[PDB]
């Protein structure tokens, strides 16, 4: 039993809700919240910009030191950093950004990072401003992640379409 509430169960291990991931994190304080990161951990907009704002920019400060020490992530890769006031940990995962021409096959590799964590609160990778089809992202999520994932979808219209079209 865990504290995630109001989710629709899609599969054995994947759950979905129309929710603002920021507000969901602040309420649940999950062990792991997933950030829709880029390789530079520049958290400007989309999910990343919203998460970082909720930490009063502490996520960005921590991220800049991480990059100064380690260099950029790989597309499809991840790193674990602090969850600040939102979660114990933040798993920063880089899905491919279609508006940069990145190979969409890298989406499966990106979701594989989730399997290193037993339970996660997450957005749909590569959705939103990353330009991929969120229906496809949900399919890859279901077919790749074996651990327990609670997906927060900000847009109600999209949420209803994702549920109604789910196979
Ligand atoms: C408006 C955007 C969804 S914005 C959103 N909702 N949840 C999340 N997570 C990350 N971005 N995001 C959209 C709708 C329908 C087709 C494509 C794109």
Curated annotation (Swiss-Prot):
Protein name as catalogued: Papain-like protease nsp3
Activity control: Inhibited in vitro by GRL-0617.
Residue ranges constituting the Macro domain according to the UniProt record: 1-167
Record text on subunit structure and interactions: May form homohexamers. Interacts with N protein.
Membrane topology: Multi-pass membrane protein
Reactions the enzyme catalyzes: Thiol-dependent hydrolysis of ester, thioester, amide, peptide and isopeptide bonds formed by the C-terminal Gly of ubiquitin (a 76-residue protein attached to proteins as an intracellular targeting signal)
Localization of this protein: Host endoplasmic reticulum membrane
Species, as recorded: Severe acute respiratory syndrome coronavirus 2
Protein purpose: Responsible for the cleavages located at the N-terminus of the replicase polyprotein. Participates together with nsp4 in the assembly of virally-induced cytoplasmic double-membrane vesicles necessary for viral replication. Antagonizes innate immune induction of type I interferon by blocking the phosphorylation, dimerization and subsequent nuclear translocation of host IRF3. Also prevents host NF-kappa-B signaling. In addition, PL-PRO possesses a deubiquitinating/deISGylating activity and processes both 'Lys-48'- and 'Lys-63'-linked polyubiquitin chains from cellular substrates.
């Amino acid at each position: 039993v865990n504290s995630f509430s109001g989710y629709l169960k899609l599969t054995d291990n994947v759950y979905i809700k129309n929710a603002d991931i920021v507000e969901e994190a602040k309420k649940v304080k999950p062990t792991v919240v997933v950030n829709a990161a880029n390789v530079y951990l520049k958290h400007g907009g989309g999910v990343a910009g919203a998460l970082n704002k909720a930490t009063n920019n502490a996520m960005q400060v921590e991220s800049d030191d991480y990059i100064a020490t380690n260099g950029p992530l790989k597309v499809g890769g991840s790193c674990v950093l602090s969850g600040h006031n939102l979660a114990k940990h933040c798993l920063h995962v880089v899905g491919p950004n279609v508006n940069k021409g990145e190979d969409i096959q890298l989406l499966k590799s990106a979701y594989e990072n989730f399997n290193q964590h037993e339970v996660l609160l997450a957005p749909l990778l590569s959705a939103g401003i990353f330009g991929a089809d969120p229906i496809h992202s949900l399919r890859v999520c279901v077919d790749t992640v074996r651990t327990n994932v609670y997906l927060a979808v900000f847009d109600k219209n999209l949420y209803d379409k994702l549920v109604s079209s789910f196979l």
